Design a protein around this nucleic acid. Structure first.
Ligand SMILES: [Mg+2]
Ligand SMILES: [Mg+2]
Lengths: 704, 749, 250
RNA sequence: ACCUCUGCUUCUGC
RNA sequence: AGUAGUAACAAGAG
């Protein structure tokens, strides 16, 4: 290998090293192909060099270069750039592409040249190259170490001095190969994947076996020669009979109910008031700056005149309750004094308390605080259990009722052309007439508005205490626009990094409900009595006190992102009702939408009175499934996720009994434990567990 | 009347209203803080189900390793990891006997795919643990960091470009006693002060590098539905991804031809397979033959399958193949048998009297006073301290990262294959479908005690091979109804629309892509998930509203006020044909049921003003960012269940095909030099694509450097444009002199 | 014209780090460092888009926008900024920049768009001239069966389609891949005639050609005809309980 | 305390 | 305080 590194020129060494590295073999190992490729590249470069094309088109054998070359070298390059060279040449002229890669290209004759440097007879290798490379205009030009040549059709385009230098250099290299004693092995030499383990990985492989094996190759020989002879049956006879999947017969008449937890009553945890909310309205708003939320808030605020000096009538027991009073007074004073489209509050002390400014501990390093006597890790206690209270059922009752306003305004659609689009338009209009005046649609509008405004304010004003009015816009039955104000939200600082990062806000919501009639519902609220208004009724007209429910609440980026998308509750309700319509339409072989929505018979069980199971119409089913999806979105929790996933199996087992499909379990007690593990303190999960118990009692009465 | 929606199931069957049991309109549960406790819980549980195994100290890493294979048989119905090797080999032998030629053809296809795979196939992946940085990186930059550290340390077989030479370099790098990596630290000096970050070359030991190469980075699974408590997941490093690739390629070629395998098929194909197995198991041999179906779940699936069993499976499937191929496929269970788990970010400590908080790492958990912790964490750390090896926990049993999904499917399909009538010759037989964790099992017999004996036979055979059927979550009934991966079969598959409800809404790519994705999602759910026509119309309306509010592109005649109102209003007033404006430009919605399959630019093309159409479809626009043909019109969607999918949409590239800005937190960290490295890499790839325009379409191959290839291309393009009238002779001479100057600069430095 | 790129190449090789990268990175390894990023793939793009569209400058555009559009519009909205996107040379722009381009940017010629995006315009041509019949309600018997979803493909595999696209879009860089079939020669001649002087990006042209010339299949539940022009409108014709009678155009 | 930077980036796998 | 729930946020970094 030292002869090839000594006699040949280093550019030929570089070309041969690139060729062998591209082909995987090595000059240090296989050196016969190394010296053969080096001699081939030497002959090809002596063919190519010192041949130029002038500014007329004649070969002037010069030694200095402003004339372009006559030959272009395609041998020795990488294969992809060589095929790029060949393809650009053939697209420059008009010639068809050859099947193999040649060695040179002559721009004078416009021809691809092929050169093979052999260690045997010139004629045999030339006839081999001719029989192989047949079917294309390739000028084969075979040389050898004998100082002779063979060409295609006896057309010799290379000049006499270049061929004389080629033959002289080949004879000199043959004499230097023969005097050095390295010449016969050239005439003697004229899917193989390997993957073994190096020793550290071999010792790693020896320690990753079953325990009766010490060598990895011993284990390979065992696995390759394994024949089964009843190993499974022998270990099945040897296994204890306490490993079994015994089937317990499932019968809903004998199963127990879910055990709902004990403790204090569950409290309200929604981000705004639901059945207890009170709105100040402006009918057909047309004030200056209408559309801007603070302008609508001042316009709806001017409709109320019965303000007083606000007093605390229900205290938040863990809070500084006079701070909430000062917050409402500062907010009202700043609304009366504002001159713009937005409102940022001063960072007073009571507002800083209510928004939790400075409540994060100072972030330090561990060695700087190692010796603190009460440096403890964070409290990771389970949630405290709560009892089911009566208010969440009445909230769900009011959420599925009809109001007097349309709350959903849908965007425009493309025009109906197909008949199925007209069928879909009639069915969608039936569902919209059954669902747009529902109170859960009003809750959708409140939540989408609040979460949209809170997310935009949290992104754009991270250091500001922005005031966000709680505004919906509805239409009456006469079609008149109405703007409703429910109260205000004061945002805190909102440097929201993680998706679970909390922005604290203060909710201040109008109400007519006295909180002392149901105080366990309001354990997070400080309720102020802010005024009096005249409610006019059928008996007389009475001055009711107007209350303000003030609360510190918090939301995250992911929570208000999901609150922004609460209109998909409509899709869930409409999809279920439409699948129920289409199931009857496939049977009756006609469209069943108008018989469903028009025939006002009570034929769907949707409730219970003391007189038994109550039935309703399909529009009641629409509003009830809508309110269920809305309350799933409002009271979303991991408890609800676990409860729904685990109680679905009990529902499917009851359905399997009612289909006479003979249901059976393997561990019903573990299933009941997995259901009851998820019922902790969330009022909606407690109501859903009570609902499962009521459905189970109704099934047990329907059977027996 | 107190309203109860569950009473709807008194009239409607539960499967026909099953969407009222999926509360998927609210936010999913998320974890806060670390996942160190979930990771330590996983390691403690994995060692508890295998505790009657044999402990051995590893000679190469020092890790305490538990071996439950061929251990004592289980004595109760608790989850156990005592899989028997001979039972596994008997089941794989039965799977080979029932499918003759399957293993040999899968092995031959894997052999043919090994010789054609390049290293850049490892760029396709999510967050890979980077042993160079001891953190998570994207898969391509983790691969680039590994290749760079390997080339700096003398491992350069991967310069051939194929994957198997990179794998040879990975295995040969374990012989290094001093692998040299580069870290980072800040240097602040100075009357105004400037500060930058300088590199520092560290040298790992042999044990340090071997522990880093076998490290899984653990974190918490977020946004998972159906559970009360969070679980931990793991991502592996770059040293094992290439071996896991070939093992999963073999197991995918096996699972594609098993009709009892639920992998790797979509929803409709899995429903077709379940319908076929229900039709086969209800053809009835006699007339009084019983048929029962187990709606099954497997408890602690990943914590009880063992890498040594997977090693035996790989060596038995490949029986009769070349030994290099057997060793190469055996590397990945061997490296999973010696794996260690990184224990997360640690914990936060709080001082209430001094009002401070601090973050201790998981490396500090081995040497810290136990008085800081609560009782659960204190018990976890005391149980975990004997498994500790250099900041990581030793985790020999179990499959924590869970990458052998198709191999676990092969193991479950072998137990399903055992229950043929011609193999068992019993009074019972079984069949079903296996999709990794989930399984359906139809058991047929003549009496109910035959059904119980078949259930016990299946359950004990699964216990012999480390498969633990969940008795709390499984139930049995007569064949006609079951559930499989939230697919509810009640004499036919029913619709479960609530599973697809998070996919409705704005996808979050750009305006054009999200319009295409939203209409395609509505169309796909109309075809597959039985979305009705009225609900599809309302879904179009709700998507258009969420799209207008998300991108602030309300209609030009409306009276809202955003940052984009005045500009869209100017475009609205200057437009003659308003119906040709896109929704992103303040135009009307064109979509109904019949045209959801038509992109919005084509649907409005004949209605556009020609000037607006020329501005909107201008190819010389600075907003669009074409990178690669294979990534064109691709989004990554994350469904409510399952891993993230690649979704193809149909969209004309306009000025609404822009890209959002990147996260900028790296500028405050030590890794801000990665930005400069990425910028230089993008500039080099841009000038290479100036020389080689097909590189954006077909990946160019070559062992020569980029500069040499560009110089050769410049030389041939000059000679081809000189002899064609395109380029003069002085420009040719200037190009050749510039190439010679570039060669001189290359030879200089 | 290929003289500016070699000047840019010499200016890059004059820098030491770019020279070290271009001399150490092979052509095959450049597919690895092409995808080098600090930016990770977004795991919640819906929430991230809702959070970013509230920002002032959430869009990254090419820096030449600073010469293309003004810094402010007629309303005084800042359209672009000088701050760079992370790990890139792109600057941070406003959505008002996109609206300004759509109402007042350079008008280009769009006669190549119905030829490049012909697969998309064929769907609208089939829908516009389609005939709707009556809706029939009955139990639909759908069969989950693998059909094809590419109305108007050419019977070419991925290798043959790759050869045709390489002969049409990038004709000098095909390598050792000659067009074996005469149908491929017909598609190549027709597409080189149609897609001539095309200023649409070659990435989009190669993408649309690959979407056109390759037969693609899906697993769908079909109740009636399984032809690819009927699978194209499968959401429109069949339902769970209804069938819409429809014949497409052509 | 002023000022600068950041808002998925020490933490989202198959 | 509040969000929340098995660990965090209640700004982080310089
Ligand atoms: Mg709460
Ligand atoms: Mg299951």
């Amino acid at each position: 290998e030292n002869f090839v590194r000594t006699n040949f020129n280093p550019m030929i060494l570089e070309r041969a090293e690139k060729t062998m590295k591209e082909y995987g073999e090595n000059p240090q190992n296989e050196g016969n192909k190394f010296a053969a490729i080096s001699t081939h590249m030497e002959v090809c470069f002596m063919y190519s060099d010192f041949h130029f094309i002038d500014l007329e088109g004649n070969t002037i054998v010069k030694e200095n270069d402003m004339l372009k070359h006559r030959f272009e070298i395609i041998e020795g390059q990488e294969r992809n750039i060589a095929w790029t060279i060949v393809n650009s040449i053939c697209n420059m002229t008009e010639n068809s592409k050859p099947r193999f890669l040649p060695d040179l290209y002559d721009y004078k004759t416009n021809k691809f040249i092929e050169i093979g440097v052999t260690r045997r007879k010139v004629e045999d290798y030339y006839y081999e190259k001719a029989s192989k490379l047949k079917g294309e205009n390739v000028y084969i030009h075979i040389f050898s170490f004998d100082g002779e040549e063979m060409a295609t059709d006896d057309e010799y385009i290379l000049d006499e001095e270049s061929r004389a230098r080629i033959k002289t250099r080949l004879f000199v290299l043959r004499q230097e190969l023969a005097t050095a004693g390295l010449w016969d092995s050239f005439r003697q030499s004229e899917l193989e994947e390997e993957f073994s383990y190096p020793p550290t990985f071999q010792r790693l492989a020896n320690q990753s076996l079953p325990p009766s094996f010490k060598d990895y190759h011993q284990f390979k020989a065992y696995v390759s020669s394994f024949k089964a002879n009843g190993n499974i049956e022998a270990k099945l006879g040897a296994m204890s009979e306490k490993v079994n999947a015994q089937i317990e017969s499932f019968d809903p008449r004998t199963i127990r109910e879910l055990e709902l937890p004990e403790g204090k009553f569950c409290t309200q945890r929604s981000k705004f008031l639901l059945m207890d909310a009170m709105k100040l309205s402006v009918l057909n708003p047309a004030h200056e700056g209408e559309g801007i939320p603070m302008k609508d808030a001042k316009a709806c605020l001017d409709t109320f005149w019965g303000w007083k000096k606000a007093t605390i009538i229900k205290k938040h027991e863990k809070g500084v309750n006079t701070n909430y009073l000062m917050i409402w007074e500062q907010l009202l004073e700043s609304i009366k004094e504002m001159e713009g489209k937005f409102l940022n509050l001063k960072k007073t002390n009571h507002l800083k308390w209510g928004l939790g400014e400075g409540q994060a501990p100072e972030k330090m390093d561990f060695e700087d605080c190692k010796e603190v006597p009460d440096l403890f890790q964070y409290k990771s206690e389970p949630p405290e259990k709560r009892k089911l209270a009566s208010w969440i059922q009445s909230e769900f009752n009011k959420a599925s009722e009809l109001t007097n306003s349309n709350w959903i305004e849908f965007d425009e659609l493309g025009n109906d052309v197909a008949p199925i689009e007209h069928i879909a338009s009639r069915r969608r209009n039936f569902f919209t007439a059954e669902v747009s005046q529902c109170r859960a649609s009003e809750y959708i509008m409140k939540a989408v508005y609040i979460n949209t405004a809170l997310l935009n304010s949290s992104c754009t004003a991270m250091e500001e205490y922005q005031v966000i009015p709680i505004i919906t816009k509805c239409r009456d039955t006469s079609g008149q626009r109405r703007t409703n104000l429910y109260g205000f939200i004061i945002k805190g600082r909102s440097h929201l990094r993680n998706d679970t990062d909390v922005v604290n806000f203060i909710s201040l919501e109008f109400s007519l409900t006295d909180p002392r009639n149901e105080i366990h519902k309001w354990e997070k609220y400080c309720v102020l009595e802010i005024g009096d208004m005249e409610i006019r009724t059928s008996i007389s007209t009475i001055m009711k006190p107007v209350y303000l429910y003030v609360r510190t609440n918090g939301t995250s980026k992911i929570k208000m992102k999901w609150g922004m998308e609460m209109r998909r509750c409509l899709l869930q309700s409409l999809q279920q009702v439409e699948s129920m319509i289409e199931a009857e339409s496939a049977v009756k072989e006609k469209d069943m939408t108008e018989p469903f929505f028009r025939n006002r018979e009570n034929d769907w069980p949707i409730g219970e009175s003391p007189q038994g199971i109550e039935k309703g119409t399909i529009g009641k089913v629409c509003r009830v499934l809508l309110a269920k999806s809305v309350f799933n979105s409002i009271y979303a929790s991991a408890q609800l996720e676990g409860f729904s996933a685990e109680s679905r199996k009990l529902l499917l087992l009851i359905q399997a009994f009612r289909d006479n499909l003979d249901p059976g379990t393997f561990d019903l007690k573990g299933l009941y434990e997995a259901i009851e593990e998820c019922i902790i303190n969330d009022p909606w999960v407690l109501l859903n567990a009570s609902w499962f118990n009521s459905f189970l009692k109704a099934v047990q009465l329907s059977m027996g | 009347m107190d309203v109860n929606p569950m009473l709807i199931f008194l009239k409607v069957p539960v499967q026909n209203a099953i969407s009222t049991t999926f509360p998927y309109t609210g936010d999913p549960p998320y974890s806060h803080g670390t996942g160190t406790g979930y990771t330590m819980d996983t390691v403690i549980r994995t060692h508890d189900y295998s505790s009657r195994g044999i402990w051995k100290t590893n000679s190469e890493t020092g890790a305490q390793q538990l071996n439950p294979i061929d251990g004592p048989l289980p004595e109760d119905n608790e989850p156990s990891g005592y899989a028997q090797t001979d039972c596994v080999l008997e089941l794989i032998e039965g799977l080979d006997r029932s499918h003759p030629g399957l293993f040999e053809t899968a092995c031959q296809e894997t052999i043919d795919a090994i010789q054609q795979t390049r290293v850049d196939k490892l760029t396709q992946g999510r967050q890979t643990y980077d042993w160079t940085l001891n953190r998570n990186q994207p898969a391509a930059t983790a691969l680039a960091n590994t290749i760079e550290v390997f080339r700096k340390n003398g491992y350069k077989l991967n310069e051939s470009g194929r994957l198997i030479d990179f794998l040879k370099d990975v295995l040969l790098s374990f012989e290094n006693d001093s692998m040299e990596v580069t870290t980072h630290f800040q240097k602040k000096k100075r009357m105004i002060t400037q500060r930058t970050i300088g590199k520092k070359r560290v040298k790992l030991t042999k044990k340090n590098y071997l522990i880093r190469a076998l490290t899984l980075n653990t974190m918490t699974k977020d946004a998972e539905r159906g559970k009360l408590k969070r679980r931990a997941i793991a991502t592996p490093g770059m040293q094992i991804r290439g071996f896991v690739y070939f093992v999963e390629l073999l197991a995918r070629n096996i699972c594609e031809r098993l009709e009892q395998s639920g992998l790797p098929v979509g929803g409709n194909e899995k429903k077709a397979k379940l319908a076929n197995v229900i039709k086969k198991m209800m053809a009835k041999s006699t007339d009084e033959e019983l048929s029962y179906t187990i709606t099954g779940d497997n408890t602690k699936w990943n914590e009880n399958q063992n890498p040594r069993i997977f090693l035996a499976m790989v060596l038995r499937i490949t029986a009769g193949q070349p030994e290099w191929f057997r060793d190469l496929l055996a590397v990945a269970p061997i490296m999973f048998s010696n794996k260690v788990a990184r224990l997360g970010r640690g914990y936060m400590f709080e001082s209430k009297s001094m009002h401070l908080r601090t973050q201790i790492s998981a490396e500090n958990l081995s040497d810290i006073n136990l008085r800081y912790f609560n009782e659960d964490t204190k018990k976890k750390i005391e149980k975990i301290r004997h498994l500790m090896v250099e900041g990581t926990a030793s985790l020999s049993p179990g499959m924590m990262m869970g990458m052998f999904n198709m191999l676990s499917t092969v193991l479950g399909v072998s137990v399903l294959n055992l229950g043929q009538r011609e193999i068992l010759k019993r009074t019972y037989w079984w069949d079903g479908l296996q999709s990794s964790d989930d399984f359906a099992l139809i058991i047929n017999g003549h009496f109910k005690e035959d059904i119980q004996q078949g259930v016990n036979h299946f359950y004990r055979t699964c216990k012999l091979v480390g498969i633990n059927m969940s008795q709390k979550k499984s139930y049995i009934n007569k064949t006609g109804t079951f559930e499989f991966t939230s697919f509810f079969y009640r004499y036919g598959f029913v619709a479960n629309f609530s599973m697809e409800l998070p996919s409705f809404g704005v996808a979050g790519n750009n305006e054009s892509a999200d319009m295409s994705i939203g209409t395609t999602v509505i169309k796909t759910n109309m075809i597959n998930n039985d979305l009705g026509p009225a609900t599809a119309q309302m879904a179009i309306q709700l998507f258009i509203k969420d799209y207008r509010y998300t991108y602030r592109c309300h209609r030009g005649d409306t009276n809202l006020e955003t940052r984009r109102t005045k500009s869209i209003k100017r475009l609205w007033t200057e437009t003659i044909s308003k119906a040709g404006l896109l929704v992103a430009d303040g135009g009307p919605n064109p979509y109904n049921l019949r045209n959801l399959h038509i992109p919005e630019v084509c649907l409005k093309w004949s209605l556009m003003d020609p000037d607006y159409r020329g501005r909107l479809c201008n190819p010389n626009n600075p907003f669009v960012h074409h990178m690669e043909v294979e990534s064109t019109n691709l989004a990554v969607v994350m469904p409510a269940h399952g891993p993230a999918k690649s979704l193809e949409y149909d969209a004309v590239a306009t000025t609404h095909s822009w890209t959002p800005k990147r996260n900028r937190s790296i500028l405050n960290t030590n890794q801000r030099g990665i930005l400069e490295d990425e910028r230089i890499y993008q500039k080099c790839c841009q000038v290479f694509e100036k020389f080689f325009p097909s590189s954006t379409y077909r990946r160019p191959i070559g062992m020569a450097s980029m500069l040499d290839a560009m110089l050769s291309r410049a030389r041939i393009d000059a000679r081809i444009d000189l002899e064609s009238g395109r380029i003069s002779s002085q420009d040719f001479s200037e190009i050749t002199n510039t190439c010679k100057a570039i060669e001189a600069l290359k030879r200089q430095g | 014209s290929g003289m500016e790129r070699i000047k840019e190449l010499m200016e890059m090789v004059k820098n030491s780090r770019m020279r070290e990268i271009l001399t150490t990175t092979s052509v095959d390894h450049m597919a690895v460092i092409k995808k080098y990023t600090s930016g990770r793939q977004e795991k919640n793009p819906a929430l991230r888009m809702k959070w970013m569209m509230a920002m002032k400058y959430p869009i990254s555009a090419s820096s030449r926008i600073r010469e293309m559009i003004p810094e402010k519009d007629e309303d005084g909205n800042t359209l672009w900024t000088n701050t760079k996107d992370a790990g890139s040379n792109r600057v941070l722009v406003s959505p008002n920049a996109v609206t300004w381009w759509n109402r007042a940017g350079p008008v280009s010629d769009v006669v190549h768009y119905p030829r490049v995006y012909k697969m998309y315009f064929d769907r609208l041509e089939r829908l516009t001239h389609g005939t709707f019949g009556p809706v029939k309600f009955y139990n639909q018997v759908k069969v989950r069966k693998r059909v094809d979803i590419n109305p108007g493909h050419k019977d070419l595999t991925s290798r043959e389609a790759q050869e045709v696209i390489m002969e049409v879009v990038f004709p000098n860089e095909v390598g050792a891949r000659t067009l074996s079939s005469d149908a491929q020669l017909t598609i190549t001649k027709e597409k080189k005639e149609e897609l001539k002087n095309c200023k649409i990006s070659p990435i989009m042209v190669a993408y649309m050609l690959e979407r056109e010339l390759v037969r693609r299949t899906r697993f769908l539940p079909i109740a009636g005809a399984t032809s690819s022009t009927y699978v194209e409108v499968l959401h429109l014709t069949q339902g769970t309980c209804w069938e819409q009678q429809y014949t497409p155009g052509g």
